[model samples]
Target: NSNICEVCNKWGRLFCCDTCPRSFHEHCHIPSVEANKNPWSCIFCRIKTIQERCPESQSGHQESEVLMRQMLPEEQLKCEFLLLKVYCDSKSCFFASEPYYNREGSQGPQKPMWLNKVKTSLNEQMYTRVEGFVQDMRLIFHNHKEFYREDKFTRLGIQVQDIFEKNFRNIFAIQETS
Candidate 1:
């Protein structure tokens, strides 16, 4: 039996995620849950299927540094996959789009970040280095951490942040600098 809605942190009247230990209330989850579907999976777990069979090309990278512009196609694909993985995580319901109706606009490091805004920059080939990309990713999660530290949503952002760093290191074949 499930204990609480992973999104809202509400107990009772929840649905179980067959893929992970978490559960959710029907409405709290996006698109809502269907009564007919048994063993429903959560976003974090569902992304695994797409993640597992992806990239025939090895996403590995070198111990030496390479700029994002010079990234191999294989490494490039890993970036996309990693972004999608985070999008599919709890953030899909939060940071995937605009920050909010107010739209806090500033060029500051603390400026609000959104996932689409992060991806949209790809058209312009922005991010001088992959480090910039990670910075953007970190900014999103960090803002979430401070904005609503007490909320369930923050946990989801934190969770996705964990997966991103691990995969970022593996895909790039770089040890996180000390």
Candidate 2:
């Protein structure tokens, strides 16, 4: 079902707002809408604007506080990442057409198929998850660097992150900076 904001007829991408329990589109909030496409919060009630919230500050907040800060769902993050994997898959149509996604058309000669809605949406989700996973890993690694250093699990995690980062960059040039 399509979500609709009670205050505005705009479509709702989120199921909750900054203050109200109502859902709204990324553009719903006059003050907070992510027109710049930055993550958005509803205009109804913002406890702390994102601009004022630091990454460390988010850690101090309750789980809901942090989760609600984003307009997308956690599950969707995994879906998005999976989609990105497909998009960047070397065998996929998107990879064969890199110079296009690169925005640097001058990167050289090319043969890229214009993506249909399906490919586009899939790539969006994948890339989004790629970011999400990086965030999650960053927080975990940051908090447990010492412990991870001595733990096999932590070492494995480091290896995994390295593998993921290398593959992601090789496929799409996206880098995880933590």
Q: For this target, which candidate reaches the highest lDDT against the unseen true structure?
A: 1
Worst 10 residues of 2 by lDDT: 94-103
Worst 10 residues of 1 by lDDT: 100-109
Per-prediction TM-score: 0.51, 0.24
Name the lDDT value of residue 105 in candidate 2: 21
Candidate 2 ranges beyond 4 A from true positions: 1-79, 82-133, 174-178
What residue pairs clash in candidate 1, if any at all? none
Clashing residue pairs in candidate 2 are 80-125, 80-126, 84-126
User: Each model's C-alpha lDDT?
Assistant: 0.62, 0.38
- Tens-place lDDT digits, model 1, residues 1-178: 4696765566978878877787777755533466776868665564455457675324555544543445444444445556655654554557777774332442233588877776766435675566667778888888877766465756877787887777667655564466
Alpha carbon lDDT at 91, candidate 1: 45
Query: lDDT (0-100) at residue 94 of candidate 1?
Result: 72
In terms of TM-score, the best-performing candidate is 1
